[PDB]
Design a protein around this ligand. Structure first.
Ligand SMILES: [Zn+2]
Length: 258
């Protein structure tokens, strides 16, 4: 049937419906810290989220998305390896059934408990739909989550998950500040890649932060209570919604730090 993260419709099956799954710039990838090249020409990232306007949180059957108003340059990302302004449209997470797995990207083969993806689109293309059809259409900021101390700024998200337990459910989610999810340092790695879930388009400039944020065992546990299924259908817990690392092929990972 349609794609998912199960035994019969998982990542290993995606190529049948989406041939690009075996493409030349697929994500995620393993970041080998010793092979990454320090690039002195990489500018610091510029994250301007002070005017961000969150609108809703939704369970789309693959994860839960926090959507923002992207009709104006309210929350933008620029600098780094980017040319132009990229507007934040939504953020979501990828997590595992156990604390030892869950992230999509890995660092020297190390897996994290979860991975946060803040998705931005290049304003020169007018809208998200047009942007995904361009090689420099999207900029995704990836942040690793490790289990340890609780992250205060994440609790607002955790507490509303009960309201969107099943696929298709959404809830008003206003005044959420994404700055509360950022680590102290903005040092990063960057490489050209793709969406990590269908349609797997190769339109993403990945920016993966080196510093993970810590979340409590209790906070991640609540993520694991969500359902892939819709209301009224057999319960399938939403866990392990991550794609395994793909071949780097002819690509180089650059680092903003040495
Ligand atoms: Zn993602």
């Amino acid at each position: 049937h349609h794609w998912g993260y199960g035994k019969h419709n998982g990542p290993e099956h995606w190529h049948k419906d989406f041939p690009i799954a075996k493409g030349e710039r697929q994500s995620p990838v393993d970041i080998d810290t010793h092979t990454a090249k320090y690039d002195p020409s990489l500018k610091p990232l510029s994250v301007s989220y002070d005017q961000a306007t969150s609108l809703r949180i939704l369970n789309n059957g693959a994860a839960f998305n926090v959507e923002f108003d992207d009709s104006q340059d309210k929350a933008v990302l620029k600098g780094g390896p980017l040319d132009g302004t990229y507007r934040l449209i939504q953020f979501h997470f990828h997590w595992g059934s156990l604390d030892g797995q869950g992230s999509e990207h890995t660092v020297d083969k190390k897996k994290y408990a979860a991975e946060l993806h803040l998705v931005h689109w290049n304003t020169k293309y007018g809208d998200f739909g047009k942007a995904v059809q361009q090689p420099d259409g999207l900029a995704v900021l990836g942040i690793f989550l490790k289990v340890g101390s609780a992250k205060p700024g994440l609790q607002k998200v955790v507490d509303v998950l009960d309201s969107i337990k099943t696929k298709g459910k959404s809830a008003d989610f206003t005044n959420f500040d994404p700055r509360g999810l950022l680590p102290e340092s903005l040092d990063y790695w960057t490489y050209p890649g793709s969406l990590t879930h269908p349609p797997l388009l190769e339109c993403v400039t990945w920016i993966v932060l080196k510093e993970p944020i810590s979340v409590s065992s209790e906070q991640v546990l609540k993520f694991r209570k969500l359902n892939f299924n819709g209301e009224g259908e057999p319960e399938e817990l939403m866990v392990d919604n991550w794609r395994p690392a793909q071949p780097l092929k002819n690509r180089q990972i650059k680092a903003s730090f040495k």
